[PDB]
Design a binder for this molecule. Structure first.
Ligand SMILES: CC(=O)N[C@H]1[C@H]([C@H](O)[C@H](O)CO)O[C@@](O[C@@H]2[C@@H](O)[C@H](O)O[C@H](CO)[C@@H]2O)(C(=O)O)C[C@@H]1O
Length: 425
């Protein structure tokens, strides 16, 4: 019954603007980069001119002993690669003046919130993520940050709608924040560092748990499927495949044609920089390309419920993922077929977004016959110790979001500069 956002930065009507009633003024530097496909995604480099300043209407400048307030935004932070990034806290969102106010800063594996009163009393709340981990929910993936502040008790940091850390701030006095907000890498020693950011909001209350969940859901664009990094999933774009039940395996073929089969094999192998990161290799196996079938939309964005074809790239040539549904048993083994030779075989796939408590960006792929009847979600099944890819209605008959739909949960991984791995070929 009341929108509590007092700043809402959004790309609309050809400009990045504040949608709130305050219409705070925005100044964009010459070295700010925008995503051509998703116009709201903003890239800030470690350069002077790569910045955005917001001039706040005076009535919303924070100068108080008592007022509760919150902030939210989405961020995508490239993997830290070099020891130059160790022990180097750098500001990214600045509303400090004369050593009072608030800021968001980053450090190796950290997102930090700092409040400081006019007597120089400080409090920090921190989200810490490891870079020594097989598959990270956080490294180089879009994350939803929310920070809330109750002047009588705690400051809280949430990540993807989940509470991470809370610390008391009731000892802080008057906090006199800056007249402007500066989005800019300030004090970062790594010359190659950047961030992606979108949807920055300020709120004039402490947001509650539900409000934060709703904000997360709404801002996530659930009508559009996402790749592994959290960007829009696209047609005609090569992707490496991740199966969430077996994250240490990758997709391979051996032989194309109807006597061949797709399968999962492991382990993936590792990428490493000693003391800096140790992760599973992501660029392994045969790449998949999503192809337009039924969609009436002209763009290359894959939408929830889009019926598509899936192509497999083998030796730089495209083949069609298909199966003969007539085969005995509920599990229908998938093959990589010459596109002209697919005939009446089952090949149409319905793309669907999943969302739950686990990792973000999950996709399901429901194979259908040519009459539109379900063959089943694409997962895998053991045949003589070989984990062959299959379409199976066994998945569709399982309880939703429960652990038995893990095997048919996939993510699509394109090569990305914030990951830094070199493909083997
Ligand atoms: C709750 C229950 O009965 N669970 C069964 C399970 C279900 O039938 C299935 O998961 C659907 O929910 O099936 C089980 O596996 C069976 C094998 O033990 C048996 O040798 O062969 C069966 C098929 O002919 C079937 O595969 C399973 O998945 O564990 C048995 C389990 O109790």
């Amino acid at each position: 019954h009341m929108d509590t956002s007092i700043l809402n930065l959004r790309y609309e009507s050809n400009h990045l603007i504040d949608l709130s009633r305050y219409a705070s003024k925005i100044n964009i530097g010459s070295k700010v980069n925008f995503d051509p496909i998703d116009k709201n995604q903003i890239q800030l480099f470690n350069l002077e001119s790569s910045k955005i300043e917001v001039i706040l209407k005076n009535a919303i400048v924070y100068n108080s002993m008592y007022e509760n307030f919150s902030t939210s935004f989405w961020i995508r932070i490239p993997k830290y690669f070099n020891s130059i990034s160790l022990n180097n806290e750098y500001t990214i969102i600045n509303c400090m003046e004369n050593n009072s106010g608030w800021k968001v800063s980053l450090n190796y594996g950290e997102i930090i919130w700092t409040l400081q009163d006019t007597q120089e009393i400080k409090q920090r709340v921190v989200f810490k993520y490891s870079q020594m981990i097989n598959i990270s929910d956080y490294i180089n993936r879009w994350i939803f940050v929310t920070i809330t502040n109750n002047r009588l008790n705690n400051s809280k940091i949430y990540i993807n709608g989940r509470l991470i850390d809370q610390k008391p701030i009731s000892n802080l006095g008057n906090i006199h924040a800056s007249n402007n907000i500066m989005f800019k890498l300030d004090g970062c020693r790594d010359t190659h560092r950047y961030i992606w950011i979108k949807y920055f909001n300020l709120f004039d209350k402490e947001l509650n748990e539900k409000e934060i969940k709703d904000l997360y859901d709404n801002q996530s664009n659930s009508g559009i499927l996402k790749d592994f990094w959290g960007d829009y999933l696209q047609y005609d774009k090569p992707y490496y495949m991740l199966n969430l039940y077996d994250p240490n395996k990758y997709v391979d073929v051996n032989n194309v044609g109807i006597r061949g089969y797709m399968y999962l094999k492991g382990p993936r192998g590792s990428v490493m920089t000693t003391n800096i990161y140790l992760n599973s290799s992501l660029y392994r196996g045969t790449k998949f390309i999503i192809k337009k079938y039924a969609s009436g939309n002209k763009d290359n964005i894959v939408r929830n419920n889009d019926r598509v074809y899936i192509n497999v790239v083998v030796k730089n040539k495209e083949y069609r993922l298909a199966t003969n549904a007539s085969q005995a048993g509920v599990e229908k083994i998938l093959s990589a077929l010459e596109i002209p030779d697919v005939g009446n075989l089952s090949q149409v796939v319905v793309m669907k977004s999943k969302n739950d408590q686990g990792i973000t960006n999950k996709c399901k792929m429901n194979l259908q016959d040519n009459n539109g009847n379900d063959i089943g979600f694409i997962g895998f099944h053991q045949f003589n110790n070989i984990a062959k890819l299959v379409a199976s209605n066994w998945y569709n008959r399982q309880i939703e979001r429960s652990s038995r739909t893990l095997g048919c949960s996939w993510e699509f991984i394109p090569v990305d500069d914030g990951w830094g791995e070199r493909p083997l070929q």
